[PDB]
Symmetry: D2
Subunit: 144 residues, 4 copies
């Protein structure tokens, strides 16, 4: 449920993960810096603390709390309570992260008010919430 | 919208399509033989004539009637109006077909009485409802 | 050893094969039309009739003569007797074909005078010399 | 020419890299532990300090020098002075690392005399030796 990869000062390219999704709970992806700030989170919520099939993007500093939430239409959660393999890739952009899933671009996310790269840790977290089918991680990836 | 490949008689192997899904309408996969009998159709109904996110399997002779329709679950229909990229593979068994989507098995279809392989056609058909994102086909593939 | 797919008239798109190579012999890719003219053959000679690791492109009418033979370089022929997995794709241009192996372009073949697309057959043929590892074909693929 | 990924205590699974090979020089892959020992190196030598198209596997402790060298037949170096995309995956086995390339297994390598996992850093190094076509890294990967 927790694993991660730790990379050389990544000021370009993209990280990516492949996982089997879960019917409940959520699957978050963390993009830390050296200060251990959160340059970005990608929180896909399958069935979480009240909401289904919701995608959240945010960023905080280590010590302070969260910023304005981003919910973008386009994340391929399955309907019907199903589960499938999802590919998510995060591109390290010039003016921001660019997120896509299963090869289809979800959204551009400009770097938060003084929180630019490099990314140095990339982290997958699954948090269960009573899931009949738990998430399964297949792969973590840095691209150059 | 309508595309196919003609193989050499396959009795062993598998077939694969890759496409971006539509928000409405349906996407059908026809496995024919010589006589243009449907050994199996895989009808992914995203929104079609009053069904949402419905997987239909079945078979009919060339100019015959449909058999009883199998309705499996586990098909990565995106929630909430979305479109994603789908990967679908059918393994041509010695028993029946084995259906998969995104590296995940959905169901076993024992061939219908009188409709064994050889398969010689693999067909893609998309049929529009009122979809704002029509499906676009990517790849058609035989596996040996 | 010998396998193919029949497409709908492709004038736009690409075709793909994936195979494990042999140590000796050759592997040819034929792009036919209706009249069974060779719009293009891609003849990878691993050891064939006194050529080692030789890439031959060419075209002939159905019951006609070969044209002048193009001999490109850059084809991932394994060294030292080895077998590997090859990925070959041909893009059906508006100019000619674009040849690729393992995500890498090898050459541009402007269609031969009188042999434009539509392509309707994509054929794989392996011909043994004295190879201790015969080639085994994996996938045949049209791209749209 | 140098990049690497740093992983959670990997006692199973496999690491992998995708690169564009170089016409000369060599491309080494390092599997370190926490002591910064070398659990394994995978040195593919395209054109190195006297030899062509040679594959070397070894392991040392941090302070002492190398062990017995392993050269396994099967690495897909290109002939002819060419370059192509190579996929190498290293599986973290029960009794050893298991190496394959382009989906074809090269060899089992049992853990060196008291040098078992976990792996914690995975590292790509290209060292040039007058190369007309330098290696290009595409991706580093941990598999679970
Ligand atoms: Cl027909
Ligand atoms: Cl014919």
């Amino acid at each position: 449920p927790i694993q991660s990869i730790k990379v050389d000062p990544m000021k370009s390219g993209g990280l990516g993960v492949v996982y089997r999704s879960p019917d409940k709970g959520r699957v978050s992806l963390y993009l830390y810096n050296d200060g251990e700030d959160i340059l970005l989170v990608v929180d896909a919520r399958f069935d979480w603390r009240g909401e289904q099939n919701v995608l959240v993007l945010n960023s905080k500093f280590a010590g302070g709390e969260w910023g304005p939430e981003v919910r973008p239409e386009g994340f391929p959660f399955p309907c019907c309570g199903y589960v499938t393999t999802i590919t998510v890739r995060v591109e390290i952009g010039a003016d921001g992260f660019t997120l896509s899933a299963n090869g289809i671009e979800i959204v551009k996310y400009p770097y938060r008010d003084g929180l630019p790269p490099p990314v140095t840790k990339f982290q997958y977290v699954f948090q269960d919430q009573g899931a009949s089918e738990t998430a399964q991680l297949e792969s973590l990836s840095a691209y150059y």
